[PDB]
Target: Protein pelota homolog
Amino acid sequence: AGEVKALDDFYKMLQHEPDRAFYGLKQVEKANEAMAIDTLLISDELFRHDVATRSRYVRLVDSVKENAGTVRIFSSLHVSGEQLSQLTGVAAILRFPVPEL
Model:
């Protein structure tokens, strides 16, 4: 609902300002280091089944909230979550561009 609105806005951002729409954990982590994130979009599959990697995901979630961002956790039982999953399970809409990409 909010989930599908956010993901719509992600695809919109790819058209409107591509430098404010990233996917992939490395890109999204770089954007959070700059505190640039508007919304983090994450599949709950990524928490499901490896301690280090899961911890990396939980740090990211908490850190994004600490940086005045919003996190939206997607089920994978609709087309919306399935699509996020095709983008590696993590994406972000950025509030600001990150000049260093």
